[PDB]
């Protein structure tokens, strides 16, 4: 239940299911099963549609019932990931060889980042750091979520730090996951940007990130003060969904009262002249609204 009623001039422009056009300052809307914003009589709020990719609102558009679709979005295979680590320059070179994901004294640090394939399966990617000599650290990776994956015997990259402990080379490497339940692997660039070798400390992962996700439910929608309607999604992205139109008449005294505070245009009032809040004839909405799904 949204509330964007108008203490100002301007009317919202509504249509009934037959396309007849009505006007009201009442701003109480519910999102119905048809994915329209409707008043208590079931009339549909109208505005300019969004078109293109990315979707945008054009100046040339016919007002139409606002929709807030409601259709899902696909999954998203990971193509980037990052891990920022602080490594201890005083760490020992492990004496236990060879490196093995199962021998905890064969490496200096282990971290994890969960990535996704196109089907949305999670792959828990384990990342192991093995100090090889002064200022150099071999990095092994392994998809812990794939039982058929070969154990890592060769490093995916080697981090080299300069005398000041700043990352000098080896900080970017393409990784391919294993496969899960017959689905194709993810292939992503793994970045160690902003990783450093401290003069003294304990090996510690400060941050990880990646850009994939599972077909997953999302979050909120809002009406901005220019009447643009935007959806907010759980992938940290947004989509414009429409833009509410306002109407003005040459003679408001001529409008036919329909009861409640709803009105119809007449010969006496003149035709509705349309625009948007915050432009031309119309000032901004007093605030807008924000609603969780």
Curated annotation (Swiss-Prot):
Print the keywords alphabetically. Answer: Bacterial flagellum
Tell me where it resides: Bacterial flagellum basal body
Which residue positions does the secretion signal occupy? none
Which family would the database say this protein is a member of?
Belongs to the flagella basal body rod proteins family.
Domain of life, per lineage: Bacteria
Query: Tell me, which GO biological process terms does this entry list?
Result: bacterial-type flagellum-dependent swarming motility
Which GO cellular component terms, listed alphabetically, does the Swiss-Prot or TrEMBL entry include? bacterial-type flagellum basal body; bacterial-type flagellum hook; cytosol
Lineage, top ranks:
Bacteria, Pseudomonadati, Pseudomonadota, Gammaproteobacteria, Enterobacterales
Protein name as annotated: Flagellar hook protein FlgE
Q: Which residues of the full protein are shown?
A: 72 to 364 of 403
Q: Which organism is it from?
A: Salmonella typhi
